[PDB]
Write an enzyme that holds these catalytic residues in place. Structure first.
Site, PDB file in Angstrom:
ATOM      1  N   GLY A  25       0.703  -1.223  -0.082  1.00 60.29           N
ATOM      2  CA  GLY A  25       0.063  -0.107  -0.012  1.00 60.29           C
ATOM      3  C   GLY A  25       0.870   1.417  -0.177  1.00 60.29           C
ATOM      4  N   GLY A  27       2.759   4.410   1.872  1.00 60.49           N
ATOM      5  CA  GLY A  27       3.493   4.769   3.137  1.00 60.49           C
ATOM      6  C   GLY A  27       3.537   6.134   3.369  1.00 60.49           C
ATOM      7  N   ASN A 101       4.236 -11.843   9.476  1.00 64.79           N
ATOM      8  CA  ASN A 101       3.009 -11.425  10.180  1.00 64.79           C
ATOM      9  C   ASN A 101       2.957  -9.855  10.728  1.00 64.79           C
ATOM     10  OD1 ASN A 101       3.432 -14.611  11.411  1.00 64.79           O
ATOM     11  ND2 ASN A 101       1.814 -13.943  10.040  1.00 64.79           N
ATOM     12  N   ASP A 143       9.131   6.288  20.207  1.00 67.95           N
ATOM     13  CA  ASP A 143       7.936   5.563  19.683  1.00 67.95           C
ATOM     14  C   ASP A 143       7.741   4.029  19.756  1.00 67.95           C
ATOM     15  OD1 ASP A 143       7.534   8.167  18.036  1.00 67.95           O
ATOM     16  OD2 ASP A 143       9.315   7.654  17.257  1.00 67.95           O
ATOM     17  N   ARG A 147       2.336  -1.153  17.590  1.00 64.51           N
ATOM     18  CA  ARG A 147       2.349  -0.818  16.185  1.00 64.51           C
ATOM     19  C   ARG A 147       3.609  -0.930  15.513  1.00 64.51           C
ATOM     20  NH1 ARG A 147       1.214   3.594  18.519  1.00 64.51           N
ATOM     21  NH2 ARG A 147       2.688   5.374  18.287  1.00 64.51           N
ATOM     22  N   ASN A 148       4.722  -0.607  16.254  1.00 64.14           N
ATOM     23  CA  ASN A 148       5.857  -0.332  15.656  1.00 64.14           C
ATOM     24  C   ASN A 148       6.911  -1.539  16.083  1.00 64.14           C
ATOM     25  OD1 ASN A 148       5.467   2.021  14.580  1.00 64.14           O
ATOM     26  ND2 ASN A 148       6.065   3.396  16.523  1.00 64.14           N
ATOM     27  N   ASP A 161      10.563   1.392  13.005  1.00 63.47           N
ATOM     28  CA  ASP A 161      10.075   2.645  13.156  1.00 63.47           C
ATOM     29  C   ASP A 161      11.046   3.736  13.577  1.00 63.47           C
ATOM     30  OD1 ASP A 161       8.432   5.026  12.995  1.00 63.47           O
ATOM     31  OD2 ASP A 161       8.098   4.705  15.098  1.00 63.47           O
TER      32      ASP A 161
END
Length: 274
Positions: A25, A27, A101, A143, A147-148, A161
């Site tokens: 997708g 970024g 994953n 961060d 999610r990272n 990240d």
């Protein structure tokens, strides 16, 4: 030691050795995809590939490649590996470790209550080990969040990240970012993992997340959470940053739980006053 910044820490890859198999997708700076890299030894590996958008600004190029200048300084099994960059042809690319994953928070949300406690602890130990290396290098991530973290086909978790809910009170209050504020964030990741990717503090108003945490309120124990792991969260969330465990201590704590899995049998949207 980490050095704050590209070809010093990143290999220039020959684009002939890169093939694209699947577009994922959009970024921040362009497209994200996956594919294959042919190494100099002729070995072929899967890789994640990110491109810089056509018609990029020089600032966008600097910020995009800046990721590689940081990531490339690290070489550790629980830190996403930089395979290299392409800069001598366009589109400009960053090529990294393929992680089947994906992001850990979304992965866990697809598998609510489906892993064993020991599997979850193994994920957490990997994250802690990567963070021990980053902090040993003097790099403060700022961060650190589920999610990272990326997770591979064998459930190995790796820091990526290179966010009020994940940030320590002192970092929110006056931008005091240290490895101990990353330990705070790690405590939040621990909660995220044991909660199977629930959002920390759900959708509380940000001002309330700030005030509640300041008043001594903490995220509640996830369902069926081992007492040892909820205590570890509370320790990571000490108000006094000097009283938080170091990453080396977190790794040691988790290693003990893995070695004595019976310890995990002792079990502990409202915040709890601590």
């Amino acid at each position: 030691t980490y050095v704050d910044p590209v070809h010093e820490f990143a290999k220039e890859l020959d684009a002939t050795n890169i093939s694209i198999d699947k577009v994922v997708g959009a970024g921040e700076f362009g497209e994200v995809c996956s594919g294959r890299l042919k190494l100099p030894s002729k070995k072929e590996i899967s890789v994640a590939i990110k491109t810089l958008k056509v018609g990029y600004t020089e600032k966008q190029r600097r910020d995009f490649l800046g990721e590689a200048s940081i990531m490339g300084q690290f070489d550790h099994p629980n830190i996403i590996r930089l395979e290299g960059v392409v800069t001598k042809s366009k589109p400009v690319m960053i090529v990294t470790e393929y992680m089947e994953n994906g992001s850990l928070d979304s992965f866990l949300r697809k598998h609510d209550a489906q892993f064993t406690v020991i599997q979850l602890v193994g994920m957490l130990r990997g994250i802690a080990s990567g963070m021990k290396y980053l902090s040993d290098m003097g790099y403060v991530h700022r961060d650190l969040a589920a999610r990272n973290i990326l997770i591979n086909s064998n459930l190995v978790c790796k820091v990526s990240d290179f966010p009020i809910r994940w940030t320590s009170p002192e970092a929110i209050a006056y931008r005091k970012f240290t490895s101990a504020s990353d330990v705070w964030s790690y405590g939040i990741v621990l909660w995220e993992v044991m909660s199977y990717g629930e959002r920390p503090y759900w959708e509380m108003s940000n001002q309330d997340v700030i005030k509640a945490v300041d008043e001594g309120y903490r995220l509640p124990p996830p369902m069926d959470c081992p007492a040892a792991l909820y205590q570890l969260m509370l320790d990571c969330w000490q108000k006094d940053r000097n009283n938080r465990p170091k990453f080396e201590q977190i790794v040691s704590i988790l290693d003990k739980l893995i070695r004595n899995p019976g310890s995990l049998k002792i079990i502990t949207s409202n915040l709890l006053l601590d």
